[PDB]
Structure 1
Amino acid sequence: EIGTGFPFDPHYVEVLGSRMHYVDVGPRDGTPVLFLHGNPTSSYLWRNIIPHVAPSHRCIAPDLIGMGKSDKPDLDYRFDDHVRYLDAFIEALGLEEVVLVIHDWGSALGFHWAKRNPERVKGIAFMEFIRPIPTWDEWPEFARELFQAFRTPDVGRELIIDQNAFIEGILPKFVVRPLTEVEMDHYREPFLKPVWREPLWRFPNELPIAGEPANIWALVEAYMNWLHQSPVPKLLFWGTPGVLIPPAEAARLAESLPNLKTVFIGPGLHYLQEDNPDLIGSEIARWLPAL
């Protein structure tokens, strides 16, 4: 049975003049494991993963700026803003070497940080991560018109900002099993007001699909190139049919990435942590000793 509670004491740290919230559990020494969520989630997404890792390793799960329990400064909320705040968060906590556990826009942040700090990354576990998607044909058909509308002037803001489409529509449609009302209310809480929803609209407008936007496309290409030459231990979780990482892409990564273990989790769309947390958490726990 998949837990709905969030039994983690809040921790806060001042970052660039704002407060950021994070989970921090597990032993106080050793290599920390840094869990990075994406859109439109928070550290809540990791709530059933972390308890598998916390017996043996420090677990740190921040809420990205403007998300979860973190502050909501007056930012553009472009990808580079998230880069700046996560960079400063990692330094504020004095992290030296880390293991990354990353998902969605948290994976773009994590891989981009790893490329810039390769000596500090001891391993990377990832799932449903940001890759350059070559055509809209590789996007799931049932969500293609919706994500094209998110990236259409005016219409996308009406859907995401005014109608909260990313929380009420996309989030439950990208989990195979049904989310409960308690889980939905945890995901809803940081975005109850439209004025808080800018990050939810910025993120799909930065997805690198069919070459655009060019700046994100090049950045993601750069860290994918880094990943392909890196000897760092890697662990990929994938499901079927997937969203960002269809089975054919999981197969391509299994062939091309060095030092990669792959784990098929069964049915899965995008929020794989909500479909098979016990397999994801237990397999990360089993993989960490080999690092």
Structure 2
Amino acid sequence: LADLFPGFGSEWINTSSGRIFARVGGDGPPLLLLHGFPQTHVMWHRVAPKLAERFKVIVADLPGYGWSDMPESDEQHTPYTKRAMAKQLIEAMEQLGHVHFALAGHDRGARVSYRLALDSPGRLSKLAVLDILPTYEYWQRMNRAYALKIYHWSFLAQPAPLPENLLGGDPDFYVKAKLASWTRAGDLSAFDPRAVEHYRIAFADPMRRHVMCEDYRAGAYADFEHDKIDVEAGNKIPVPMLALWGASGIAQSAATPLDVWRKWASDVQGAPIESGHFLPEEAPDQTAEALVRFFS
């Protein structure tokens, strides 16, 4: 596996729920970057170098993802709920002396991110989410058209071991199908081939695949309920946040993203990017420029 963060350090951060692997680089205000499915921290390898010019960039693998430890799940998928992942990452940042930091997330990491901002808003200076609406919003707009588009939200949430057994016949196919299908081009040309190998090797592990399904199971139940409580209470994110989405990504399909995020955040700024779902890889310059301008 190639080193896609030249000049970055490598930290194994002990937490109560297991170690968090993270690439660390740059100097200045701390900036935590969180990846999503079916990816690892290396999806940031094209925009984290630019972020390292201005920030202490911490490129972390999600709990259970990449090289981070995999906490054993339970019937409620607790460790892979976004609320528990946020607590673990807060604990991880405390190990480095970061009790107040900027945070940008993509896909699952973005769901950890906005959940972090709702649960522990005092930990974030600024927040950025990439090509997501809140989990509640995806489920509340799960009509026929949307159910066909993000079928994997219902499929991967099926009880174990149904998705795990089906994924176990050809994991390379599914991980590359998911990467290709969500891009603007519809193939794998946007990604670095070395980055694809990072995602393919991580997806080759049956334990890692179970974790991702547990992530999606928590996304269909516990994550939805924690969100549902916040909507119906009217709890908004007070942290100033940036909402980035691809013009042909996932978030723009179900709704107009900025109007949705204005219901969830008292101070949200939104901008589209001509790209599919993988903004930091399909459009690295535009995403990096947007994150540098926001967090500065």
**TM bracket (short chain):** 0.7 to 0.9
**Counterpart code for 1:191:** F
Structure 1 segment 123-272 matched on structure 2, within 5 A: 123-131=126-134, 132=136, 133=138, 134-137=140-143, 140=146, 143-153=149-159, 154-164=161-171, 166-177=174-185, 178-179=187-188, 181-208=193-220, 213=221, 215-222=222-229, 229-246=236-253, 248-253=255-260, 256=263, 257-268=265-276, 270-272=277-279
Report the CA distance between 1:226 and its aligned residue.
Answer: 8.8
Partner residue of 1:14? 14
Report the CA distance between 1:138 and its aligned residue.
Answer: 7.4
Taking a change above 3 Å as real, the CA distance of residues 78 and 55 of structure 1, as seen in their structure-2 partners, is closer
Partner residue of 2:53? 55
Distance in 2 between residues matched to 1:40 and 1:202, nearest whole Å: 13
Distance in 2 between residues matched to 1:51 and 1:87, nearest whole Å: 23
Contact in 1 for aligned 2:34/2:109 (Cα 8 Å): yes
For normalisation by structure 1, the TM-score amounts to: 0.82
Report the CA distance between 1:127 and its aligned residue.
Answer: 1.3
Report the CA distance between 1:59 and its aligned residue.
Answer: 0.9
* Partner SS, residue 267 of structure 1: coil
List runs of 5+ in structure 2 lacking aligned partners. none
**Counterpart code for 2:12:** Y
Deviations 1:131-173, CA, capped at 9 Å, x for gaps: 1121322764654445433333454222334433652322221
Report the CA distance between 1:61 and its aligned residue.
Answer: 1.6
Contact in 2 for aligned 1:166/1:200 (Cα 8 Å): no
Distance in 2 between residues matched to 1:226 and 1:93, nearest whole Å: 34
Distance in 1 between residues matched to 2:145 and 2:48, nearest whole Å: 30
2:286 to 271, 279, 291: 279
Partner residue of 1:78? 80
* Partner SS, residue 126 of structure 1: strand
* Partner SS, residue 246 of structure 1: helix
Distance in 2 between residues matched to 1:175 and 1:88, nearest whole Å: 33
Contact in 2 for aligned 1:234/1:259 (Cα 8 Å): yes
Distance in 2 between residues matched to 1:191 and 1:93, nearest whole Å: 29
Tell me how large the CA RMSD over aligned residues is. 3.0
The range that moved more, 150-159 or 53-62, is: 150-159
**Counterpart code for 1:244:** A
Distance in 2 between residues matched to 1:69 and 1:170, nearest whole Å: 20
1:122 maps onto 2:91 in alignment: no
Distance in 2 between residues matched to 1:231 and 1:72, nearest whole Å: 31
Contact in 2 for aligned 1:140/1:243 (Cα 8 Å): no
The range that moved more, 115-124 or 96-105, is: 115-124
**Counterpart code for 1:78:** Y
Deviations 1:56-88, CA, capped at 9 Å, x for gaps: 111112112221122345444531553443232
Deviations 1:191-225, CA, capped at 9 Å, x for gaps: 323233211211222334xxxx2x32121235567
List runs of 5+ in structure 1 lacking aligned partners. none
Partner residue of 1:105? 108
Contact in 2 for aligned 1:115/1:226 (Cα 8 Å): no
1:91 maps onto 2:94 in alignment: yes
For normalisation by structure 2, the TM-score amounts to: 0.81
